[PDB]
Design a protein around this ligand. Structure first.
Ligand SMILES: *[C@@H]1O[C@H](CO)[C@@H](O[C@@H]2O[C@H](CO)[C@@H](O[C@@H]3O[C@H](CO)[C@@H](O)[C@H](O)[C@@H]3O)[C@H](O)[C@H]2NC(C)=O)[C@H](O)[C@H]1NC(C)=O
Ligand SMILES: *[C@@H]1O[C@H](CO)[C@@H](O[C@@H]2O[C@H](CO)[C@@H](O[C@@H]3O[C@H](CO)[C@@H](O)[C@H](O)[C@@H]3O)[C@H](O)[C@H]2NC(C)=O)[C@H](O)[C@H]1NC(C)=O
Ligand SMILES: *[C@@H]1O[C@H](CO)[C@@H](O)[C@H](O)[C@H]1NC(C)=O
Length: 592
């Protein structure tokens, strides 16, 4: 028996026991995440810990099989993924050290309460009190205090922690065949085999950077517009040819300029399409929302939800009978038990959200044919990108009129279109540079290119040169503002949002081009395009069996990211911004 045949037997065993154990874990997690109950909490911990142990032991055993001697790229990929043990190689001592550091950083983050000068008790935790301030306040001093306090009482505390976390994680990375924790994270995009469908980890840097080059002009003009309107709101502090203060971006970090819409609304009279009132009138219940979503997916040719979906999902808050976590989640428990958890209300947002989450469900149903280790999206962004393209189609007033939530005679005034596209811009085009800069700083820091003495300095240097944002109060290396973000303090990648964003518009433009739609890409409802849903399935079923490049080619027609779809989607807004910015400054001073 060739070592590969023995390998097949190994994996065929792994997936057979794993599929099961993961289903047991997932059912326990449905129990806890729904029927919050200490008992159920304890059972969740038990089952998840058994999953952890199984994966770890099977990973060691997989290492005892040599990847270099595996033929079928499919088998090789499953093995490779299972062979990536990670924390195992480090001594159990060092393991507990890093576990304690991650736990302590997350506990500092969660236990984050800053107090207000003049108030010895206005001290409030982050999620309850601080954010509203950073999103619905027009007081420079209040927002300033919040921003400074977090990056002061929390970032400083995390500073030594993250300092040692970098060294430990780097040792873990190089413990595996890796140059830095950066290369380890970049490997999630690394795939090999097939014809030229291979993507080396270091190519990710090249591609992210060139895509950001093409997106830079749009971000520049968006910067101008937001800057000028904010100037009129905060005149004493904003400079016309300068970067923007961080505390005025709409959230503690300024990851999404969405909350700046009231202060930066194009026009401002033409109301915003809110079918919410219409839903409230047609008595649309949560089930009706999800049923219309089902009808959409059937229209493009995709299947409809299992009986199990309608019978086992929690589509509504559990009245008052139980206590639940509301954050919307899509669930593939394994073994065909697909579900969705949401505290669905009667709101356009929850409607579009149901379409997104059900798109996740459809992806899950489409790759059930694949084995366990290949039952996932091709990269880390395929999934949420599919989800988002659903909401894009379900937001076009065309589809809103079809479902009967907007009168037929209703017409789109160019003004309302610009308003909508600008809101999309802040939330999308705003996080794009923020994301690039965050992950670049982390990548270089893990690569060591940024020494600790110039750790924070570079950070704000980039925040200005890239993001176009400036520090309100100068911060020394005593601070650690990067750790101030949950995705950074809790050891999570961040480039996923950038990649997802670039992907979703590529997908939407390809599929729309299939539906033979003509006109702006912000007006596309792939509804009834059997061919569109067919291409989508022809990718979705592939899972991660085939290279992510292959999935892309099967859908969009290219093997690598392309920003041209994103630009085409926002091009109207781009031109309007250019004209609105002619007699003003488009750019920002680096040192300011
Ligand atoms: C989903 O869309 C299909 C498209 O034809 C609708 O046709 C239904 O197809 C199903 C499956 O082939 C047929 O079997 C049914 O399955 C459900 C799910 O377990 C079960 O509850 C039914 O008693 C039946 O066994 C079904 O006869 C057929 N119905 C038609 C043609 O009216 C289907 O209606 C959609 N899904 C569901 C659950 O109805
Ligand atoms: C995508 O395709 C669907 C078809 O499933 C389109 O919805 C359909 O729209 C037509 C025209 O309004 C509806 O016609 C209706 O026929 C019934 C037959 O009894 C009649 O009583 C009504 O007065 C009306 O004329 C049709 O029922 C409806 N399909 C449904 C409700 O399942 C939809 O407009 C298409 N969307 C896009 C973006 O192309
Ligand atoms: C919720 O948990 C409690 C405590 O473990 C248990 O007695 C009860 O049967 C559970 N109910 C549901 C609906 O999960």
């Amino acid at each position: 028996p060739s070592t590969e045949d023995l390998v097949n037997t190994f994996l065929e065993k792994f997936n057979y026991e794993a599929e099961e154990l993961s289903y047991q874990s997932s059912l326990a997690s449905w129990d806890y995440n729904t029927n919050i109950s200490d008992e159920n909490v304890q059972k969740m911990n038990n089952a998840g810990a058994k999953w952890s142990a199984f994966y770890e032991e099977q990973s060691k055993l997989a290492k005892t099989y040599p990847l270099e001697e595996i033929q079928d790229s499919t088998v090789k990929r499953q093995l490779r993924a299972l062979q990536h043990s990670g924390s195992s190689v480090l001594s159990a001592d060092k393991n507990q050290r890093l576990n304690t550091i991650l736990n302590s950083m997350s506990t500092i983050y969660s236990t984050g309460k800053a107090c207000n000068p003049s108030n010895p008790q206005e001290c409030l935790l982050l999620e309850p009190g601080l954010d509203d301030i950073m999103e619905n306040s027009k007081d420079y001093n209040e927002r300033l205090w919040a921003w400074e306090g977090w990056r002061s009482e929390v970032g400083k505390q995390l500073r030594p922690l993250y300092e040692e976390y970098v060294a430990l994680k780097n040792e873990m990375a190089r413990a595996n065949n890796y140059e830095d924790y950066g290369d380890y994270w970049r490997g999630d995009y690394e795939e090999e085999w097939e014809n030229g469908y291979n993507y080396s980890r270091n190519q990710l840097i090249d591609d992210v950077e060139h895509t950001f080059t093409q997106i830079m002009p749009l971000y520049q003009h968006l910067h101008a517009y937001v800057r000028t309107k904010l100037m009129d709101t905060y005149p004493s502090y904003i400079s016309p040819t300068g970067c923007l203060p961080a505390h005025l971006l709409g959230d503690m970090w300024g990851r999404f300029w969405t909350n700046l819409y009231p202060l930066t609304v194009p026009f401002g009279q033409k109301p915003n399409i809110d079918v919410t009132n219409a839903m409230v009138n047609q008595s649309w219940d949560a089930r009706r929302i999800f049923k219309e979503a089902e009808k959409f997916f059937v229209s493009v040719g995709l299947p409809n939800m299992t009986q199990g979906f309608w019978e086992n999902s929690m589509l509504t808050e559990p009245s008052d009978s139980r206590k639940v976590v509301c954050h919307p989640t899509a669930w593939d428990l394994g073994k065909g038990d697909f579900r969705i958890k949401m505290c669905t209300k009667v709101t356009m947002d929850d409607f579009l959200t149901a379409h997104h989450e059900m798109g996740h469900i459809q992806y899950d149903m489409a790759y059930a044919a694949q084995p366990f280790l290949l039952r996932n999206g091709a990269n880390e962004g395929f999934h949420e990108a599919v989800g988002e393209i659903m909401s894009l189609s379900a937001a076009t007033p065309n589809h809103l009129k079809n479902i009967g939530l907007l009168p037929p005679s209703f017409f789109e005034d160019s003004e309302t279109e610009i308003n909508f596209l600008l809101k999309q811009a802040l939330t999308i085009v705003g996080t794009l540079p923020f994301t690039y800069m965050l992950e670049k700083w982390r990548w270089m820091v893990f690569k060591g290119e940024i020494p600790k003495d110039q750790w924070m300095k570079t950070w704000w240097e980039m925040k200005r040169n890239i993001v176009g944002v400036v520090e309100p109060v100068p911060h020394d290396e005593t601070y650690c503002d990067p750790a101030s973000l949950f995705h950074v303090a809790n050891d999570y990648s961040f480039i996923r949002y950038y990649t997802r964003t670039i992907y979703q518009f590529q997908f939407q433009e390809a599929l729309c081009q299939i539906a033979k739609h003509e006109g702006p890409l912000h007006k596309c409802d792939i509804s009834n395009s059997s061919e569109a849903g067919q291409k989508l399935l022809e990718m979705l079923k592939l899972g991660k069996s085939k290279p992510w490049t292959y999935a892309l080619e099967i859908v969009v027609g290219a093997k690598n990211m392309d920003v041209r779809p994103l630009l085409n989607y926002f091009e109207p807004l781009f031109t309007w911004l250019k004209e609105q910015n002619r007699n003003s400054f488009v750019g920002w001073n680096t040192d300011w």
